[PDB]
Amino acid sequence: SPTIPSRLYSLLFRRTSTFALTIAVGALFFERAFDQGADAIYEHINEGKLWKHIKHKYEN
Amino acid sequence: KGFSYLVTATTTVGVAYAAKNVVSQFVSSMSASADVLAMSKIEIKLSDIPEGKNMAFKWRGKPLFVRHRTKKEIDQEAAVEVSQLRDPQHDLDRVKKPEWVILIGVCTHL
Amino acid sequence: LSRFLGPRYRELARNWIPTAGMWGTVGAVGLVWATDWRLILDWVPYINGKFK
Amino acid sequence: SDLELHPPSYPWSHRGLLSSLDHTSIRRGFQVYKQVCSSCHSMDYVAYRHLVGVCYTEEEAKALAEEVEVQDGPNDDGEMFMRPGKLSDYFPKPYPNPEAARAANNGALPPDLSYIVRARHGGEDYVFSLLTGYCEPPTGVSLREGLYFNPYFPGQAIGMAPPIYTEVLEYDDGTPATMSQVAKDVATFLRWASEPEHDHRKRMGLKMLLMMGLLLPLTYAMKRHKWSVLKSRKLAYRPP
Amino acid sequence: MFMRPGKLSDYFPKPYPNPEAARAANNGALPPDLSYIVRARHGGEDYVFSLLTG
Amino acid sequence: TFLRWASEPEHDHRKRMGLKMLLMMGLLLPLTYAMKRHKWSVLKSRKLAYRPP
Amino acid sequence: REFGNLARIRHVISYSLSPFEQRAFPSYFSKGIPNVLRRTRERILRVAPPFVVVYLIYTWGNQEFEQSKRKNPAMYE
Amino acid sequence: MTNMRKTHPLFKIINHSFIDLPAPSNISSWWNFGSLLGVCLMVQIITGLFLAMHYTSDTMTAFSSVTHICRDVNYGWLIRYMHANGASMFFICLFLHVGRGLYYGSYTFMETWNIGVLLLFAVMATAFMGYVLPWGQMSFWGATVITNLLSAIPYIGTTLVEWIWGGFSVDKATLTRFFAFHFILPFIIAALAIVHLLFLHETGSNNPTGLNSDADKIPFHPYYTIKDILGILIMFLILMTLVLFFPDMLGDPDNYMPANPLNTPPHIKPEWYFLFAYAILRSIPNKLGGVLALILSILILALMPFLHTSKQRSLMFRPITQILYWILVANLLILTWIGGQPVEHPFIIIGQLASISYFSIILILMPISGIIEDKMLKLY
Amino acid sequence: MTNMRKTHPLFKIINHSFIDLPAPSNISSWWNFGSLLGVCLMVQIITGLFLAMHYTSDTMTAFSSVTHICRDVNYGWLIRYMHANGASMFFICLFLHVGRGLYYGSYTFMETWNIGVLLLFAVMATAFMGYVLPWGQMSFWGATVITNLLSAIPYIGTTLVEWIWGGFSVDKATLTRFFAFHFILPFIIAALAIVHLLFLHETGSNNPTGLNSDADKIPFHPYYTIKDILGILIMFLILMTLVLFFPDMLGDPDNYMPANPLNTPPHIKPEWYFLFAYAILRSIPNKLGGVLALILSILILALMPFLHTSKQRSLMFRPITQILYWILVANLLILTWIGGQPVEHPFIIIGQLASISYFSIILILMPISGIIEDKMLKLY
Ligand SMILES: CCCCCCCCCCCCCCCCCC(=O)OC[C@H](COP(=O)(O)OCCN)OC(=O)CCCCCCCCCCCCCCCCC
Ligand code: HEC
Ligand code: HEM
Ligand code: HEM
């Protein structure tokens, strides 16, 4: 009967200091994850048009 | 309270990510630019200068000293000991080539 | 300041050092996240992937 | 006459809100500019250092920068000498001053093509329509020599000879160098030269839309949560 | 470029086009521009008089 | 002298404005000091008495 | 904060005249000179010895700098 | 133990102004635009500070410096287009601010309204000189147009245009002094905004119903704190999509050419937020008449509080004056459009009738509508 | 009828701050230096606005623009030398302001003192980039020296220097960003001075006797209005005598050659306040220690309120600590002279003794003297 928001509140969302720690760690991991996902979405939209897609023809 | 604070924490994470990005872009904007990055590394050089002379150029914003040395100076600076200096380092470790010496003009005092 | 000696302020400090350590921890984590400090960020599991 | 012919909306590969440029097309357009357009036009705000990273390898950019000779100096005795170009050097002027360009181009001044797409109505559509829109003048339009009829040029009497045609250059990719292919490639290159931040800006915009589609419902939820105290508040009046 | 007689708007004529020509014509010494030499040297006009008469 | 002029072309005008400033400020400083002493004369000649019961 | 409730003053009588009825410079020299001399005598022994030792240090430093720039006659050979 | 928030002097000023401020509980999203204007001013200050960090106010090097910002400086294109589209957003927020003030009867705060009118003049001058700053073709030619329009004044105009020009035309001195003025004048705007907020806090804030809101007031924090944060986020959404997707539709392509005194542009127009004043000045066929029409059409906002002839403050319960106000907004749109296309047929008569109808509505028709509205509600 | 001076809100603020402000009746001419600093800040703002109206921040044309100001602009020489000698007079009045506070114990207003210290750093930074703005030989080399001092910081200092240089040396980007910073920081100085005045008005002003001067309070007008007017006129007399008779006795002659990055001056002499800080720098013979010595030599002003160990606020009745205070002022004079002098014997040992004495008599001897005096008056 303890749910996931209940555990999140009882562990991380209760105190302001550990709340801010959760915010900072989530900011780091979400920055990496969002950058990776948005970059991959951009590559899939623009397949075969970018320099990172066409450099292998002209290198080595 | 966990649901409401999860919403609040996700908003704060988003604002923190956007704020870090925009502050990083501003800081990198007032950092070095493409022109000063291009004009720093590449250096055109000639060999129309005799031995025992000095040439002053611009390399990485600094006065670049290209000195053509004489054999007497090379022999003296190879024969001088490093135990009496403030930092033990001889000419064969300071420079790769005896004829040409490449240095900076930025003095280590002011 | 000799007024801040004595057992009451000592146990107040004992109560407030976990919160002070937590605030220092989030300060350090925010500092390395904002500055992209490689010296610390190369020892994580995941954030190695962006090479920064 | 006083009329203007609006260029039509061509379906470029970068016309979408999240679509980038075709970098092979920018390469072919740069080759078109170097072998054809560089004899008259100038590109003084674009350099080989700008070219490297989006179209060419560093070695290839260095090679095509050193294949042209540039004027530099002064030397020790104070004389203007000539040296092979480097990456930091910009594209060379075909004329030292605009008056020399007017003298060598029958009075007309060829504009700098570093902002021509951002500085003309239509942009790359206008460039494509101007390059592929050369036609014989209609009846009653007497044009003196040195001027060519072009419906897309304002004033209809351009001072430009038709610069491109079939097999006007050779591509290194084996692409057929037809008129339309050359015009599309050089229009893509001119769009890149006008906006070098194109694909980067599009990536910023994609990240911004994903981020703001995350933030706006959540920030709106926070606003409704704080304002839920007032929006469900009940008022009662009990006079005695 | 061409040549024309000067007028009141023109400044004083250049002896050398670049300082390297000054180095070539003065065996490595650069003759400084004498528009602020009094405000630039200690003593000023006293320094100029003493330099020329010393 | 010519180099002094070329270094400071504003020399004669600066000296003339300095002479005007010297005469003018030698006129205002006694007058402004007199105005200050006039407005401040109330306090300078103020007399204080303490009369406790 | 403002006038009216600043301090608590009792049994104090203040006397003042018009600026247009009293002189702006009442005995400006015959009383100004002894007052300035008295103030100088009161606060002359706190400033003058530091300023004089500044003068002495300045002259000593300039003199011995000139003597250090002087040539030592020990190097005849 | 003391309450530091309302005890510390700077903290208690901040608390009494922004934290514990009794605000009307029912002000709609139209009340977010003052804070949007303040945030836009801060964004402009920062972005223009970086642009001036990388900008040289020399006639030979202005355009090349702008290109250097766009291409060589890291995200300098982002900074410059943030600056330009933030000017567009600044004028959008200004126009919606003024529209809120006219519709909801906020001009009865007479001194606050007058300080706002002075702010509007200062922002218009700032944006005009900033548009002159990149030294494009349209920038130089619009500068010449506006300065000659000022020179239309008899016996004063020629000396004033030679004084402002620093010479005989728009040149080195004009560009450099325009850079200095464009740098300094937003700080005067900020100080006048402190004066604006001071007068407003003296008078209190106005609700959309126009009634006495003291019966139901709420603290500014956290309600209007989070509401203004949401408004800031939406304004940033519109500003950033304008920067990153449509950066040139509110700009002008002719500004991307170097300023040529010898070559004129095909059709000279100012920026889109000067277009209604440009259209009315084209509509009146006299130079002195045109410049006086422009000046009076902006001063008529300061003249507005003496035109209130109704016993109701806001237009919430005034349908005839609502219709007249929306016709006024429509006529402002017509004036912006007519400033768009050049002065030809039928734009002559369209612009003339638009200007005459605009002045007639804002001077004669609205008080008459208020009078007959009071008569219809049986007030006298 | 209503008192508009006490009723109108801007007029109410001006009345409560400048008109009916209860001021002590016995403050000396040392209390006019705050108003002198404000007026001189306004003079610097106006004169610099004119110089930036006629100034271009490009390394090819900075010196040429300065010569154009001095030669071709009407009274541009007057504006430029007014700006330079007014910066010198600003530092004179600032040092006398700090000396008044130190002597009369005004540092017990801790918030006002700390805001003043922040203002002091802002003024030194602003004057530093103003000095590098004409792009002279000493200007460029002083910028190089101070930024290498910034490079003395471990592990981040090199990156901070490549960040603030806009490259790898003092160059175009450095000059342009220093122009922007030198323009914008005096307005932050004005805002900080408003906060300074607010913190002062929170607790009232101080008097030379150091006692509670509420027993004898006089309004600021007309007494201190005409007193500050006389002080302004005297300051203008000194500044204009400097400008029109000795426009170069406080400046540097070597600043009148164009900045050559190859050649260097034999003597690197910044302005005299920087010579004071410079002597404190070169007294300690390492980079990192010298940098913390400079920042600590400025920050012990902020550390001063915690070193006050006497039961009497002012030095008016404290004769031993008066002697130490005048020894300290004498020591700052000696330190300025050493900063002027080159690094040759005996200036190293004299400056080292001066810096050791300065830090010792601020940190150690003055509180010890206060303890001796309170024991001597039978209070310890
Ligand atoms: C003991 C003296 C007795 C004098 C008696 C005079 C007659 C008194 C009866 C008649 C009245 C005459 C007027 C009286 C005015 C007020 C009284 C007075 O002047 O007292 C003497 C005065 C204050 O006495 P006091 O504070 O006790 O001095 C102890 C010093 N620590 O003290 C002084 O004036 C002495 C000041 C000496 C200062 C010497 C400083 C030497 C070091 C300076 C270094 C500066 C920095 C240099 C650089 C260092 C690094 C290289
Ligand atoms: C020398 C024969 C040229 C060649 C090769 C190219 N251009 Fe040109 N161009 C030239 C002149 C003399 C002019 C001025 C004509 C006039 O009437 O102004 C131009 C002009 C242009 C323009 C501007 C058109 C406008 O309306 O402003 C464009 C966009 C243009 N030219 C494009 C262009 C391209 C893409 C070229 C490479 C294929 C090219 N030109 C080559 C002279 C010459
Ligand atoms: C840089 C320019 C301006 C700034 C920073 C500014 C700031 C503000 C702020 C923060 C508010 C409170 C929030 C709100 O009610 O929206 C406000 C309200 C107001 N503004 Fe402005 N404003 C500016 C320009 C103007 C203009 C151009 C006008 C009118 C012509 C004006 C007149 C008013 C009025 C009357 C109010 C009161 C509205 C009410 O009480 O409901 N201001 N302003
Ligand atoms: C302290 C505040 C400001 C500073 C330092 C500043 C500085 C600058 C600079 C250096 C430029 C040249 C860059 C360019 O031409 O793109 C510029 C341009 C411009 N400025 Fe500002 N500015 C400030 C505030 C404002 C404000 C408040 C507005 C309008 C309300 C404004 C409107 C503009 C516009 C429209 C341009 C033209 C941009 C373009 O044409 O691309 N600026 N400004």
Ligand code: HEM
């Ligand atoms: C741009 C710089 C400054 C400005 C505009 C300024 C302004 C003022 C003004 C107008 C006064 C009132 C006049 C007076 O009380 O004598 C004052 C007093 C004061 N200032 Fe400053 N000041 C500045 C710098 C400083 C500095 C550098 C310090 C200290 C390190 C400082 C500390 C004080 C203190 C403690 C007072 C109170 C003096 C008293 O109560 O008698 N200020 N300031």
Ligand code: HEM
């Ligand atoms: C809004 C305020 C200010 C502006 C716009 C401004 C602008 C300028 C400009 C453009 C210059 C270079 C012109 C030249 O030197 O020929 C300059 C120089 C200078 N500025 Fe300012 N300034 C301001 C305030 C200040 C302040 C408050 C100080 C010092 C406390 C200061 C100190 C200096 C100094 C020392 C110079 C060097 C003068 C010279 O070497 O000839 N400035 N300023």
Ligand code: FES
């Ligand atoms: S900078 Fe070379 S010894 Fe000082």
